[PDB]
Amino acid sequence: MKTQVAIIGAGPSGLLLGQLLHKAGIDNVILERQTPDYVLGRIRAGVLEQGMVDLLREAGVDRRMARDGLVHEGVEIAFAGQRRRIDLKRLSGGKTVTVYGQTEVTRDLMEAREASGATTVYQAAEVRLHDLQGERPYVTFERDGERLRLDCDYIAGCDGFHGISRQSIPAERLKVFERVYPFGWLGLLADTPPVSHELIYANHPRGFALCSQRSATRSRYYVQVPLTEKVEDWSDERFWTELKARLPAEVAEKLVTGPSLEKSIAPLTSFVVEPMQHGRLFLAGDAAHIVPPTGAKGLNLAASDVSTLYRLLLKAYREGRGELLERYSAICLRRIWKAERFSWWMTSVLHRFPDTDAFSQRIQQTELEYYLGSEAGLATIAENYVGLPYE
Amino acid sequence: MKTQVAIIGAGPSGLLLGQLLHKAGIDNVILERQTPDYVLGRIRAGVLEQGMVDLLREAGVDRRMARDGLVHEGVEIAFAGQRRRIDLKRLSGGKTVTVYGQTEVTRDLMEAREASGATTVYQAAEVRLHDLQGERPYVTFERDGERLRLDCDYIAGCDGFHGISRQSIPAERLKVFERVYPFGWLGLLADTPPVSHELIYANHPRGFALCSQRSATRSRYYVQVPLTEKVEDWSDERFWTELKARLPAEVAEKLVTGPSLEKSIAPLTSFVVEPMQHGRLFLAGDAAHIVPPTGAKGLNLAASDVSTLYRLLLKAYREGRGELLERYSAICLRRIWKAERFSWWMTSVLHRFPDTDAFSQRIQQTELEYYLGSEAGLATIAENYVGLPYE
Ligand SMILES: Cc1cc2nc3c(=O)[nH]c(=O)nc-3n(C[C@H](O)[C@H](O)[C@H](O)COP(=O)(O)OP(=O)(O)OC[C@H]3O[C@@H](n4cnc5c(N)ncnc54)[C@H](O)[C@@H]3O)c2cc1C
Ligand SMILES: Cc1cc2nc3c(=O)[nH]c(=O)nc-3n(C[C@H](O)[C@H](O)[C@H](O)COP(=O)(O)OP(=O)(O)OC[C@H]3O[C@@H](n4cnc5c(N)ncnc54)[C@H](O)[C@@H]3O)c2cc1C
């Protein structure tokens, strides 16, 4: 079989890229290792930037989002017995963020792709990339025991952190920057109304806690935990008790608890690879970088990578300007490093780090007091949170 | 002998406090371990905040400063082959900083004190504090072999980092926060015109460099060096060569070099003690806290401590409101921690740290790119640099 753009991965990056290209008349095939069900089971993201919201509209998949998404104008940070609200809207110059589950976005894209008739191969096993530096690269995979070959012009590696694409680039061509945090986030999804109409990030002596939501009757909560913890050691009962201990009293008493629909631990890490391309292979999303969830940037960076790749591919196909593709990495990395810096900052001021001396603890506390008390300080948080401009 | 306020230390803190109190009619005695000459030999500070400038006027010692000081409206940061100017004036809402040597400020204060006839005892050896928690504390010292006693109501410890005052407070009453940096600043004072009309802080792969000044014909330069260095290993020739290697080409070629009037190494440290008082003893300046020189806050924090102590002492004596003195520490510490956080931030983004991984190096570079490229980011630097409001 042959196509123009082969896409490895049917997570949000691959689906979004596939939809945008399909609409512009550029044929693409998506190869996914898992089943549609497995992909739909991943909870993940809840916060979307306006740029991503606009990209969904451009891809014509925003109906359900416009109806069901919750536009947030502010966010709250609680520390040392204080609760400070950051008016994102006022401080960023009118921008806001939208709360809409990653599961929902993925479902919308999958339904749109299914309807268009564009090619998608689930359970595509043993994907291998070939002749990346040639003019005719190809992808081989197994479907029901038989090895098939897919010829194409370009390959978009949208296969996440553990994908085959980043592994297909000669190791000596890549420079990796990585940082592993000494903690993870234990998350719990409950069919209960959220404790607040806005998100609450809490810095507490026992560790970080976050009150988020999915809708008016579905909440998502997180608590920082050591990497040595096992989810089976955390009953719903223990989670609720611990969550309450980390929140302000007035917030903790209005908390409606309930059984969990989902519970899991996500370890925190930062990861960046430079460059993000090799010959005809271009990496996008988690395949090229990981950000700790504290700043809500992961999916949102996947969106800007895809927006950039789609626009460069359009010029290559429609305008015959293939030279512009060499610029992909430089353009993406500028935004990636700034989002990484913000996600790192947020993580360092909201979490409890093991083996922290007295000086560092005081500085951490003073960072919050200063940034949340100064108009200039609040503005740096707000502009980064709503998301920096796309290039 | 008897006095109202005994002041330990004739550095800028003690002299400034002594002058303000004398003018308000509150008698004070200053005890200094060294000679006037030794004190005058310390180069130190070059940058003053507006609050300190205003306090000098209030103390009636601003003539020479108003004539000789240089008002700066901006400052420059050079990194990765770029030179970025921070318009302090525009970004802070009209505030600026004044460049006037600490040696000059000290000389002005010493001449003013000498003229007023207020008591100052130089070469006051073996100073000891007594009955701090009593209603009648006293100070003993030796002058020309004979031990004298000085009775007083209050004692102001303005004796710097190695003073006797902080050592006179029961160790279990104090909580110390400290951080030692793995480098020092090798400074050089030259009788040459400065390379720029504004300061240049430079982050370079070889390490930090700073281009400062004292007047139109006297410059002060610094380069970051390991703590294992000896000033005798650094000839003027080696210093100039190294300085040039760390500055942008265009700046390095306009550099007028010359023999040094003074050369010394200052190690970098952060130090805070809580509280800053014990009974009738109140600590001010370096006796209570040390900030790395990167943010130019040391002398400037000494000024706000003194301004607060003077105003509280005025109410105690003039208005009989002695209870207000219990508030000294809380008021000072709020400003101290914010200046410490800024001095720490400045130090971490401008210096080369040993054993820094690739991720940290990129984040350091991105911090500069973001803060110097965003209006909100530039404003946080500017408002902190000109100095946060006095309480
Ligand atoms: C707890 C948590 C909270 C988060 N919160 C937020 C938030 O609020 N906002 C935000 O912006 N981000 C958030 N993120 C991040 C966001 O979820 C991710 O960045 C996003 O999933 C990345 O999308 P992707 O398509 O690049 O990769 P993925 O979602 O990992 O999808 C990659 C796909 O490729 C498939 N694949 C893998 N290997 C192969 C192969 N060899 N062959 C073929 N197919 C393969 C995989 O099965 C998968 O379907 C959060 C993440 C977590 C863990
Ligand atoms: C390289 C460098 C650059 C700097 N640059 C700046 C700048 O640009 N701007 C800024 O704000 N700050 C700067 N600082 C800091 C500033 O110099 C100090 O914070 C300031 O000297 C503190 O004043 P002080 O009076 O509290 O203490 P000091 O200046 O140390 O004076 C204390 C006095 O007490 C005396 N004393 C000591 N022990 C006793 C005793 N036992 N009995 C009696 N007398 C005693 C000492 O001899 C001394 O005279 C810089 C510092 C350095 C090292």
Side-chain angles (χ1 to χ4, degrees):
Chain A
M1 41 205 283
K2 173 66 170 73
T3 193
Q4 294 182 287
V5 177
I7 300 173
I8 315 306
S13 290
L15 290 168
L16 180 49
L17 179 63
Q19 201 60 27
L20 289 167
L21 291 176
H22 183 78
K23 285 192 76 283
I26 300 172
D27 300 315
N28 58 88
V29 172
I30 292 183
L31 264 20
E32 169 59 56
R33 172 190 45 103
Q34 302 289 142
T35 58
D37 316 275
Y38 193 101
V39 177
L40 248 25
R42 302 189 285 236
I43 303 303
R44 309 224 182 142
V47 182
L48 315 179
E49 292 174 354
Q50 192 56 248
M52 159 119 232
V53 167
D54 293 339
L55 202 62
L56 286 173
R57 192 164 80 241
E58 176 173 1
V61 300
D62 64 321
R63 198 194 87 255
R64 215 165 293 191
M65 180 183 68
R67 187 186 80 220
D68 299 349
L70 303 151
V71 174
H72 284 206
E73 300 193 342
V75 70
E76 192 179 294
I77 302 282
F79 75 106
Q82 298 155 78
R83 294 168 64 199
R84 315 297 293 266
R85 177 175 187 259
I86 300 165
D87 191 327
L88 298 174
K89 174 85 163 185
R90 169 170 67 79
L91 294 157
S92 71
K95 306 185 184 67
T96 55
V97 292
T98 296
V99 170
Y100 191 60
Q102 175 171 323
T103 50
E104 274 63 58
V105 174
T106 306
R107 187 193 61 226
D108 294 350
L109 285 159
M110 275 163 84
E111 287 186 17
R113 185 164 189 92
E114 151 81 22
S116 63
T119 313
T120 309
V121 179
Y122 286 96
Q123 289 182 274
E126 312 286 299
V127 174
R128 290 291 177 269
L129 311 192
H130 314 267
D131 300 346
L132 298 188
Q133 303 201 85
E135 51 179 332
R136 281 174 285 273
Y138 61 103
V139 184
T140 53
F141 60 104
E142 300 183 7
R143 182 182 138 89
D144 300 329
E146 36 148 53
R147 212 113 191 32
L148 314 190
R149 169 168 173 158
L150 169 65
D151 296 305
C152 60
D153 300 328
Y154 303 102
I155 302 166
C158 297
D159 49 356
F161 192 67
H162 289 104
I164 183 60
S165 70
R166 188 177 72 248
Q167 300 172 33
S168 306
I169 298 174
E172 290 174 271
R173 224 99 165 196
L174 301 173
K175 47 194 202 298
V176 171
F177 304 81
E178 178 174 23
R179 161 64 173 144
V180 179
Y181 294 89
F183 40 73
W185 278 11
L186 167 57
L188 187 148
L189 184 70
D191 226 4
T192 50
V195 73
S196 178
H197 83 293
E198 291 182 341
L199 272 61
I200 307 179
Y201 285 82
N203 176 327
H204 184 91
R206 306 174 66 77
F208 172 86
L210 168 57
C211 300
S212 197
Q213 58 191 243
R214 286 297 181 277
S215 68
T217 53
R218 185 162 285 178
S219 307
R220 178 60 160 173
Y221 297 96
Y222 301 97
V223 300
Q224 173 197 332
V225 298
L227 297 165
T228 46
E229 295 294 320
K230 299 166 192 52
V231 73
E232 49 266 0
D233 291 23
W234 285 80
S235 53
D236 290 352
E237 181 169 340
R238 184 179 179 204
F239 180 91
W240 295 121
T241 301
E242 185 59 44
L243 208 222
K244 279 168 175 174
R246 304 185 185 190
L247 301 173
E250 66 263 36
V251 173
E253 60 179 58
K254 301 210 67 177
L255 182 63
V256 177
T257 56
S260 60
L261 303 176
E262 192 273 349
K263 239 190 306 192
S264 60
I265 293 172
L268 267 56
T269 64
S270 282
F271 177 97
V272 181
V273 73
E274 300 188 357
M276 290 167 64
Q277 68 196 266
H278 181 60
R280 302 289 188 111
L281 170 66
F282 301 89
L283 309 179
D286 282 8
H289 43 71
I290 300 290
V291 283
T294 329
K297 300 299 164 198
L299 177 60
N300 290 302
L301 275 184
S304 58
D305 284 353
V306 163
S307 177
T308 307
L309 185 56
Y310 156 63
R311 285 159 167 80
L312 291 175
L313 281 167
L314 239 187
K315 295 201 96 56
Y317 279 111
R318 193 161 80 172
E319 296 177 34
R321 307 206 60 217
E323 337 88 46
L324 297 169
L325 290 158
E326 275 289 292
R327 297 234 284 270
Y328 178 67
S329 292
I331 296 173
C332 292
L333 289 167
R334 283 197 278 283
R335 191 168 200 269
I336 291 158
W337 273 114
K338 280 181 179 178
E340 287 277 350
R341 181 216 73 83
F342 176 66
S343 305
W344 157 81
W345 183 78
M346 284 281 267
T347 302
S348 71
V349 298
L350 295 168
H351 294 77
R352 168 199 61 167
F353 282 78
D355 306 312
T356 300
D357 64 20
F359 186 77
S360 304
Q361 282 166 1
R362 269 283 195 289
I363 287 305
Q364 187 195 70
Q365 186 193 165
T366 310
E367 281 277 274
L368 289 169
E369 287 185 39
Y370 168 68
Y371 279 90
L372 294 167
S374 163
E375 279 289 298
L378 285 162
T380 67
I381 297 169
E383 76 174 9
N384 268 283
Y385 198 88
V386 299
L388 262 31
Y390 276 31
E391 296 156 287
Chain B
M1 41 205 283
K2 173 66 170 73
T3 193
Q4 294 182 287
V5 177
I7 300 173
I8 315 306
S13 290
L15 290 168
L16 180 49
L17 179 63
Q19 201 60 27
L20 289 167
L21 291 176
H22 183 78
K23 285 192 76 283
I26 300 172
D27 300 315
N28 58 88
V29 172
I30 292 183
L31 264 20
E32 169 59 56
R33 172 190 45 103
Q34 302 289 142
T35 58
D37 316 275
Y38 193 101
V39 177
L40 248 25
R42 302 189 285 236
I43 303 303
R44 309 224 182 142
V47 182
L48 315 179
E49 292 174 354
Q50 192 56 248
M52 159 119 232
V53 167
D54 293 339
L55 202 62
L56 286 173
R57 192 164 80 241
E58 176 173 1
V61 300
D62 64 321
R63 198 194 87 255
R64 215 165 293 191
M65 180 183 68
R67 187 186 80 220
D68 299 349
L70 303 151
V71 174
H72 284 206
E73 300 193 342
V75 70
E76 192 179 294
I77 302 282
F79 75 106
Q82 298 155 78
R83 294 168 64 199
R84 315 297 293 266
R85 177 175 187 259
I86 300 165
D87 191 327
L88 298 174
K89 174 85 163 185
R90 169 170 67 79
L91 294 157
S92 71
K95 306 185 184 67
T96 55
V97 292
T98 296
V99 170
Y100 191 60
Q102 175 171 323
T103 50
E104 274 63 58
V105 174
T106 306
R107 187 193 61 226
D108 294 350
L109 285 159
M110 275 163 84
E111 287 186 17
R113 185 164 189 92
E114 151 81 22
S116 63
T119 313
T120 309
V121 179
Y122 286 96
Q123 289 182 274
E126 312 286 299
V127 174
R128 290 291 177 269
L129 311 192
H130 314 267
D131 300 346
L132 298 188
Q133 303 201 85
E135 51 179 332
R136 281 174 285 273
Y138 61 103
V139 184
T140 53
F141 60 104
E142 300 183 7
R143 182 182 138 89
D144 300 329
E146 36 148 53
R147 212 113 191 32
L148 314 190
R149 169 168 173 158
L150 169 65
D151 296 305
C152 60
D153 300 328
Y154 303 102
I155 302 166
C158 297
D159 49 356
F161 192 67
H162 289 104
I164 183 60
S165 70
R166 188 177 72 248
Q167 300 172 33
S168 306
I169 298 174
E172 290 174 271
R173 224 99 165 196
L174 301 173
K175 47 194 202 298
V176 171
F177 304 81
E178 178 174 23
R179 161 64 173 144
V180 179
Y181 294 89
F183 40 73
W185 278 11
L186 167 57
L188 187 148
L189 184 70
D191 226 4
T192 50
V195 73
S196 178
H197 83 293
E198 291 182 341
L199 272 61
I200 307 179
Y201 285 82
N203 176 327
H204 184 91
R206 306 174 66 77
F208 172 86
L210 168 57
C211 300
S212 197
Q213 58 191 243
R214 286 297 181 277
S215 68
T217 53
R218 185 162 285 178
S219 307
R220 178 60 160 173
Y221 297 96
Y222 301 97
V223 300
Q224 173 197 332
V225 298
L227 297 165
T228 46
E229 295 294 320
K230 299 166 192 52
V231 73
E232 49 266 0
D233 291 23
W234 285 80
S235 53
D236 290 352
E237 181 169 340
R238 184 179 179 204
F239 180 91
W240 295 121
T241 301
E242 185 59 44
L243 208 222
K244 279 168 175 174
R246 304 185 185 190
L247 301 173
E250 66 263 36
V251 173
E253 60 179 58
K254 301 210 67 177
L255 182 63
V256 177
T257 56
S260 60
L261 303 176
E262 192 273 349
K263 239 190 306 192
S264 60
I265 293 172
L268 267 56
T269 64
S270 282
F271 177 97
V272 181
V273 73
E274 300 188 357
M276 290 167 64
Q277 68 196 266
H278 181 60
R280 302 289 188 111
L281 170 66
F282 301 89
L283 309 179
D286 282 8
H289 43 71
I290 300 290
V291 283
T294 329
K297 300 299 164 198
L299 177 60
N300 290 302
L301 275 184
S304 58
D305 284 353
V306 163
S307 177
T308 307
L309 185 56
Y310 156 63
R311 285 159 167 80
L312 291 175
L313 281 167
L314 239 187
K315 295 201 96 56
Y317 279 111
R318 193 161 80 172
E319 296 177 34
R321 307 206 60 217
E323 337 88 46
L324 297 169
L325 290 158
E326 275 289 292
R327 297 234 284 270
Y328 178 67
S329 292
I331 296 173
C332 292
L333 289 167
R334 283 197 278 283
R335 191 168 200 269
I336 291 158
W337 273 114
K338 280 181 179 178
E340 287 277 350
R341 181 216 73 83
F342 176 66
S343 305
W344 157 81
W345 183 78
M346 284 281 267
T347 302
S348 71
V349 298
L350 295 168
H351 294 77
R352 168 199 61 167
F353 282 78
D355 306 312
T356 300
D357 64 20
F359 186 77
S360 304
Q361 282 166 1
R362 269 283 195 289
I363 287 305
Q364 187 195 70
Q365 186 193 165
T366 310
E367 281 277 274
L368 289 169
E369 287 185 39
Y370 168 68
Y371 279 90
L372 294 167
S374 163
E375 279 289 298
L378 285 162
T380 67
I381 297 169
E383 76 174 9
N384 268 283
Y385 198 88
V386 299
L388 262 31
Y390 276 31
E391 296 156 287

